[PDB]
Structure formats: structure tokens, C-alpha cells
């Protein structure tokens, strides 16, 4: 049982050559005090004689003074032992992967605008800026600028919408005369290397490195980045044989490194510094820069709706040492082109790393040719379809040819909770309400501290610890969870059904109430025709049955709603839970069945023959209460904290106490 051993594994989890380890001074002396002892020159001198002792005592002080220099450098010297972050990037940058500066809040708009000139084609030139208030705050909009040129066909009726996508900040372009001996610094903070583009005289060069990088451009066009230890970015390009080497495709051969400069190739670069990570979820937009003859009659948010979405994107801290530290090793491991699934993990982690807290690369053995991806928008659970499309194509750049990237947000276990938390009034002068605003931070803290990381077993209580930890003037804290999944088809279970991975109490399997259109007719004075009647139902589990099974009981039905079949009967069992309706309609059917041990849950509404369309809503939320304390996750099913988008899943009651 557990782990038997033969002298197994190696050297803890990770190398500590540990001659380097800083020890306690006294011990350091204690070691060294021995050192001077046994020294052939004198075996006589007693060190515990306080006279020599303090003298030797001093040697250790310097020796300790000097050691942490010698030791820390090693931690520094070796990535993943590097304690300095600007260290970490260096080896990472060296490994062929860099962390980036905060990455502009980005979005798309379509806007319908009439040109006053009625020309066939207007362009939106790159660099028109728009304003967006951050969510719920109009005090200031966040400026953000047209990413690139875009033109639009004038539709007939003369009004036509262009569409374009938007990153946040201001276009900031600077020309520089290049010179042989000189650094090329941008001292700009809020810079992000991903929105950095430049022009040598004329044509654009790309840092090969995550811009294009496979095109006929022959690599003569190129340059690099680097991070000044200061925190500002300096430019770099390869000098001399800037292409691979020698003769290559040219018949004349000789040597070209470019950028002599003398004055040649005056370098003009163009970039956006940004306020980002603060701008996420900026919904209200403005058209903040006018053009000749173009007038936006409407700017309408979010083409191709998710439908659940927020304003902009992006931003970023930028920096985290933990996600960055090991990571580049995989990029150090992998080549540029992404090949391995985790190579697709780490590669995706490069670009939209600030978009994605966690990305799950996997194959679905069913569909080959598709790279199946489960990622965290980290602002939310759902990358807007353009993002999905966006990184996809960009990702798709690095990939095996027949392979296709396929990104889907996996299903998400939802933890539906009412919280009961007590505090002493007197104990806190601070505004009660804001306390709730406090805890509501510290709740996701645990998540971000834990749950999204591994998507392992989830501890309710352990979560409640930190929210307990919040005010310390909180007297007590209580909560109750309802494990919640969302369903895409009310009508038919997914083939495999649905499983909780987690034991639930019998009969504690619930669902959402929802109306149902019933063909029967309603008329009321002044109402007139009134279509027909519709009432609501919900999905009900019957009791546990022997062999841990249950049959899915449909919501209550009025008489004549469902054509009665000799096969299908009103379940009309004693047990099954029932909502209380004004109808008193007692017709209940089995639409399907479950078993509690397997946690697997199936039904089909084809069973009851009831028409899909006589239901109004396509998706229903799923309610259940796991009998077990902690929540287990397996695959693609992860508990997560999104309160803002889905507050009804998170509720907190506040108990004032004197």
C-alpha cells in the first residue's frame, strides 16, 4: 500500500546544490569556528576564549555578508531558482519565450456610419481613437484607438457599416535615426511589445518572434526586443549577415547586415501605451475621433454576439513570476512551431497570456485534425467568438498543416451559494456594505489562489476560510453550496448524459423552472386572441431507487397538454419533488433517468413526444446538491468563480451583530 521504495527518485523535487545554502550565522561561525580549529599552525588556541571568539566571530559576519552575494547569484544564475523577475525573463527571453508588458484592452466594433461625401469607399485610417467608460463608471472613458485601416463598401440606401477591432491606448509613434553605437530605448511605461510595430525607412520589419514570422520576407527584415533591467523596452535587430548567412538566394552574394546606418534607414516605430487590466468590461463606447466626411450614425456593440460578453479585453498586470517561471522551459523545450499539446498550452500562454489565466490543450479522440482547447478568458469563462477566431488563426500559424485548432470553452461546474456571515457592529466603524465588497474580493482570491489552477477537488470550507479571514471583525461566516451545471439542450440530454464526478443526495437533483408553451387557448377580456396558454415546468429527480438509480420527473402538466399514450403515463409516483403551481396540475412524466453512484444523468424529451419548440428557452441551468463535502473535478468540468456575470450563482447574507 502507498509507496514502497528502493532508494528511488532523486534529490528532492528540484536541485539545490546546497553547498550554496545560506546557513545561520552562529552555525556559520560554528562551522568556521571549527575550521580555524585543527589548523596545524596552532592546536593550542582556545576559541571559546572570548578574545579570539569575537575576532573569529567577525570573520563569519563578512563571510556571511559575502555568502548571500555568492548564493543568491546562483538562485539568480539558474532559471526557476531565479528570485528576481527581470532575471526570469532574461533566461526566458533567452529560452525563446518572453513575458510581455500589460497588453492593451482589445475589442471589435462594427459601426454604421454615413459618409457625408457618399464616396464608394471610405477607409477608417489606422489610429482613430474611441472612448469607452469602464463598466458602471462614466467618470472617465478609456480611450482606445483604431488598430488598423479598414474600408467599407457603400451599401445602397447609402448607409453602410464598416467594422473594425479596437485595442486600448493611444497610437504613439516615434522616428529615430538609427546609429551604430547607441542603445535604442523606449522609456515608455504602459508599452506592450505585442502592439509594437515599426517602420524602418519605408517597409515594416517584424521581430520574428510572434509577428507573422513565416512569409517570403526572407528574414532580412527582422529585429528583436529586450527588457532593460530598468523596466523600459529597448529595440534590437540582428547586425551583419542579418539573413541566415552568405550567398543564400542572391547571385551577387557579398555581405548585407543592413542599417549602416550612416543616416540610412531612419527608424520610425509606432506603438500604444495602455492603461489596461483596468479597462476590461468597458461597454459604452464613443466615436472619439472625427474624420473627413464620415459620420457615425450608430456604433453598435459586439457584432456576432456571444451573447454573454463584456467591453474590451486584455490589459494585464503585466507580470507574474510563477506562471512565467517554469513555462518558458516548455518553450525552451519546444521549438518555435508548436507541436505538443502542452506545447499548444504554453504557446497559447504566450499571446493572450493576459487573456487566459489557464488554457487546456487536449485532443478529442473522436475528431482528428482538430486541436481542442479549453481556456480561461480570465476576465470571464467565455472568450468572445472573435478572440476564439483571433488567437486560433494566429495560433494556427504555428501548427501541423492537416491539424486544425479548435477552441471551445468547456462546461463549467458552478458553485451556487448563499453565505451567512456575522460581524460585530461596534467592532467595525467601517461601512458595513463595503465589508461585503471586501469579502466578495476575497472569495475569488481563494479561487484564483486555488481552484482554477489545478481544477482539482474543491473545498467549500477552505474557501470559506479566507472570506472568514476578511474583516476579523466578522464574527462568523457560513455558506451552503448548490452544485450547478449548465445545459445546452433541455430537449435531449447530451448523448453521454451528464455526470457530476461528485456524489449528490438523492432527490436533491433539481433544475430550473421554465415556461412551456401549451397548445391550449387563453382569452381574457381586453386581451383578445392571446395565442394560447403557456405555463412553466422544471426538471425533477425522483427518489433514489435501489441500485442508486432515479428517473427524471418532468415538471407538472395540465390535463390535455400532453397527448396520453398507452406507453407513456403520468408518473404519478408518491416521492418525486414538485414545485407549487397555481395550476395544481398533477401530470408528471418520466422524461429520462439517472443513477446516483455513476452521477450520470440522461433524459430525452422525444420520450414524451413533446415538441422542442413548444419550449421557449434552449438552455437551462442545472441544480444539484452534492452529498459530499468537497467537489471533485475531472476533465473539462471545472468549478470556477464568476460572480459578476452570474451573480444569481453567488449570494451572501450579512448578519449584523452588536
Amino acid at each position: 500500500a502507498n509507496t514502497p521504495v528502493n532508494y528511488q527518485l532523486t534529490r528532492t523535487a528540484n536541485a539545490i546544490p546546497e553547498i550554496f545554502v545560506g546557513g545561520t550565522f552562529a552555525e556559520i561561525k560554528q562551522n568556521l569556528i571549527e575550521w580555524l580549529n585543527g589548523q596545524n599552525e596552532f592546536l593550542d588556541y582556545d576559541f571559546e576564549g572570548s578574545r579570539l571568539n569575537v575576532l573569529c566571530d567577525l570573520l563569519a559576519y563578512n563571510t556571511l555578508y559575502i555568502q548571500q552575494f555568492g548564493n543568491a547569484a546562483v538562485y539568480e544564475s539558474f532559471m526557476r531558482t531565479a528570485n528576481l523577475r527581470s532575471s526570469v525573463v532574461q533566461a526566458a527571453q533567452d529560452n525563446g519565450y518572453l513575458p510581455t508588458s500589460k497588453s492593451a484592452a482589445q475589442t471589435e466594433i462594427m459601426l454604421t456610419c454615413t459618409d457625408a461625401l457618399n464616396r464608394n469607399y471610405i477607409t477608417i485610417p489606422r489610429g482613430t481613437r474611441f472612448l469607452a467608460y469602464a463598466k458602471d463608471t462614466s467618470v472617465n472613458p478609456y480611450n482606445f484607438v483604431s488598430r488598423e485601416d479598414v474600408i467599407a463598401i457603400r451599401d445602397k440606401n447609402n448607409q453602410y457599416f464598416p467594422r473594425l477591432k479596437l485595442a486600448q491606448g493611444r497610437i504613439v509613434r516615434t522616428e529615430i535615426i538609427y546609429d551604430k553605437l547607441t542603445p535604442i530605448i523606449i522609456y515608455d511605461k504602459n508599452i506592450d511589445r505585442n502592439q509594437v510595430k515599426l517602420y524602418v525607412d519605408g517597409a515594416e520589419w517584424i521581430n520574428w518572434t510572434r509577428k507573422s514570422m513565416v512569409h517570403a520576407g526572407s528574414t532580412s527584415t527582422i529585429y528583436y526586443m529586450r527588457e532593460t533591467i530598468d523596466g523600459n523596452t529597448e529595440f534590437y535587430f540582428g547586425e551583419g549577415e542579418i539573413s541566415v548567412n552568405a550567398s543564400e538566394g542572391a547571385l551577387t552574394a557579398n555581405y548585407i547586415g543592413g542599417l549602416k546606418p550612416t543616416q540610412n534607414s531612419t527608424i520610425v516605430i509606432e506603438y500604444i501605451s495602455t492603461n489596461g487590466a483596468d479597462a476590461n468590461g468597458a461597454v459604452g463606447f464613443s466615436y472619439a475621433d472625427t474624420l473627413t466626411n464620415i459620420t457615425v450614425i450608430n456604433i453598435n456593440e459586439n457584432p456576432n454576439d456571444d451573447p454573454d460578453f463584456v467591453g474590451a479585453d486584455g490589459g494585464g498586470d503585466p507580470e507574474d513570476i510563477e506562471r512565467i517561471r517554469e513555462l518558458g522551459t516548455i518553450k525552451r523545450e519546444t521549438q518555435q512551431r508548436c507541436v505538443t499539446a502542452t506545447d499548444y498550452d504554453t504557446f497559447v500562454s504566450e499571446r493572450f497570456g493576459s487573456i487566459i489565466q489557464a488554457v487546456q490543450t487536449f485532443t478529442d479522440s473522436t475528431k482528428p485534425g482538430y486541436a481542442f482547447i479549453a481556456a480561461k478568458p480570465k476576465s470571464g469563462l467565455y472568450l468572445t467568438t472573435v478572440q476564439r477566431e483571433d488567437i486560433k488563426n494566429y495560433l494556427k500559424d504555428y501548427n501541423l498543416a492537416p491539424i486544425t485548432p479548435s477552441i471551445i470553452s468547456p462546461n463549467y461546474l458552478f458553485i451556487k451559494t448563499n453565505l451567512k456571515v456575522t460581524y460585530a457592529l461596534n467592532k467595525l466603524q467601517e461601512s458595513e456594505q463595503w465589508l461585503e465588497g471586501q469579502i466578495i474580493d476575497k472569495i475569488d482570491r481563494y479561487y484564483t489562489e486555488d481552484v482554477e489552477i489545478f481544477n482539482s477537488s474543491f473545498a467549500k470550507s477552505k474557501m470559506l476560510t479566507y472570506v472568514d479571514d476578511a474583516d476579523h471583525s466578522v464574527i462568523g461566516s457560513s455558506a451552503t453550496i448548490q452544485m450547478v451545471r449548465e445545459v445546452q439542450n433541455f430537449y435531449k440530454t447530451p448523448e453521454a448524459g451528464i455526470k457530476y464526478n461528485n456524489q449528490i443526495k438523492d432527490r436533491s437533483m433539481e433544475s430550473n423552472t421554465f415556461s412551456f408553451n401549451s397548445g391550449r387557448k387563453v382569452v381574457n377580456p381586453d386581451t383578445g386572441l392571446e395565442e394560447d396558454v403557456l405555463y412553466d415546468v422544471r426538471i425533477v429527480s425522483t427518489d433514489r431507487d435501489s441500485k442508486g438509480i432515479g428517473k427524471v420527473i418532468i415538471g407538472p402538466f395540465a390535463s390535455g397538454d400532453v397527448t396520453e399514450n398507452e406507453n407513456i403515463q403520468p408518473y404519478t409516483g408518491n416521492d418525486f419533488n414538485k414545485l407549487a403551481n397555481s395550476d395544481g396540475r398533477d401530470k408528471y412524466y418520466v422524461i429520462g433517468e439517472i443513477n446516483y453512484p455513476a452521477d450520470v444523468i440522461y433524459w430525452n424529451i422525444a420520450k414524451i413526444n413533446l415538441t422542442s419548440e413548444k419550449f421557449e428557452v434552449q438552455t437551462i441551468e442545472l441544480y444539484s446538491d452534492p452529498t459530499d463535502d468537497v467537489i471533485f473535478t475531472r476533465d473539462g468540468s471545472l468549478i470556477v468563480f464568476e460572480n459578476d456575470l452570474r451573480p444569481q450563482y453567488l449570494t451572501i447574507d450579512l448578519e449584523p451583530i452588536s
Binding site: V339, T340, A341, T363, L400
Partner: protein, 49 residues
């Protein structure tokens, strides 16, 4: 067409329809002594796409 030349691939019960061929089942095979789940995680972690 009916197919003229002939060469084999040996099998315990040769040919027939075999049984239960996936997909087009071709999705490419691997053979080794060592039991999988010992080799399962890493090859996809490393080479297997």
C-alpha cells in the same frame, strides 16, 4: 477492380473483416513491451501529437 498481384501481412486469424475498425481506423498505431499509462502521458507530452 479485382486486384492482380498479391502480398501479405501475417495475422493469427488472417484477413476476414477483422472486427470493429474505428474511424478509418488507421489513426496511427504504436507497439511496445512496456505497459501504457507508464508510457501514455509522456509521448503526447513529448512526441505524440
Amino acid at each position: 477492380e479485382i486486384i492482380r498481384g498479391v502480398k501479405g501481412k501475417d495475422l493469427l486469424q488472417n484477413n476476414i473483416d477483422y472486427i470493429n475498425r474505428s474511424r478509418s481506423y488507421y489513426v496511427m498505431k504504436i507497439k511496445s513491451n512496456l505497459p501504457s499509462s507508464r508510457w501514455k502521458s509522456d509521448v503526447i507530452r513529448f512526441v505524440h501529437p
